[PDB]
């Protein structure tokens, strides 16, 4: 069905590597993911990690990408959110059901 990417972040507290599966969008070299966490009240821990340490590793099939993660700008949100929703309509439901704006993370080389 929908492929997952494996995102590795550095635990902001422990400094240990943390891996989590996510759905993703490609924009050339960029990988885009949404810190939706099924519409939880709070941002997922991996998001907190990458905001404390922007260096992340992303594995897609056999490709291992060393990228730098940051929040999408207003204009990037406008471009990527609708693509994310088209690919996985549940994203819009999560956003509908949660207070926080769901972060969109741009991972770039
Ligand atoms: C519960 C927590 O996970 P989390 O980082 O909040 O991630 C929540 C979810 O987003 C994560 O489980 C995703 O993989 C769920 N998930 C998706 N989550 C998404 O947000 N978006 C997706 O598109 C998505 C797709 C998906 C597909 C398949 C699947 O099985 C899961 C999918 C966790 O793993 N707990 C760790 C925390 C590890 C950690 O980062 N700790 C930090 C400190 C954190 C802190 O400061 O409190 C550290 O080591 O220092 C632990 O306690 O052992």
Answer whether 23 contacts ligand 1 (Cβ < 6 A): yes
Pairing of strands 5-10, 30-34: unpaired
Cα gap 28→106, rounded to integer Å: 12
Cross-strand bridge partners of residue 26:
31
Give the single-character DSSP code of 98. -
Query: Comparing C-alpha atoms, which of 99, 41, 98, 101 is closest to residue 71?
Result: 101
Ligand-binding annotation for 94, yes or no, is no
**What CATH number was assigned to the domain covering residues 1-109?**
2.30.110.10
Nearest atom, ligand 1, residue 46 CA: 5
The length of the chain, given as a count of residues: 109
Nearest atom, ligand 1, residue 37 CA: 20
Solving technique for this entry? X-ray
Answer whether 51 contacts ligand 1 (Cβ < 6 A): no
Pairing of strands 25-27, 55-60: unpaired
Residue 36 contacts by C-beta under 8 Å, 6 or more apart in sequence?
A: 91, 94, 95, 102
Ligand-binding annotation for 18, yes or no, is yes
| 106 in Cβ contact with 58 (< 8 Å) | no
Cα gap 18→74, rounded to integer Å: 28
Residue 88 contacts by C-beta under 8 Å, 6 or more apart in sequence?
A: 2, 23
DSSP class per residue in 11-62: -TTT--EEEEEE--EEETTEEEEE--GGG-SS--HHHHHHHH--EEEEEETT
Domain boundaries, the chain: 1-109
Q: In angstroms, what is the resolution?
A: 2.1
Ligand-binding annotation for 37, yes or no, is yes
């Amino acid at each position: 069905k929908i492929p997952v990417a494996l995102l590795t972040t550095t635990g902001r507290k422990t400094g240990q590597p943390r891996v989590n599966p996510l759905y993703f969008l490609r924009d050339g070299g960029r990988v885009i993911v949404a810190a939706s966490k099924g519409g939880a009240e709070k941002n997922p821990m991996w998001y907190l990690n990458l905001k404390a340490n922007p260096k992340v590793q992303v594995q897609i099939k056999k490709e291992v990408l060393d990228l730098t993660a940051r929040d999408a700008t207003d204009e990037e949100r406008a471009e990527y959110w609708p693509q994310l929703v088209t690919m996985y309509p549940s994203y819009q439901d999560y956003q509908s059901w949660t207070d926080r704006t769901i972060p969109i993370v741009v991972c770039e080389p």
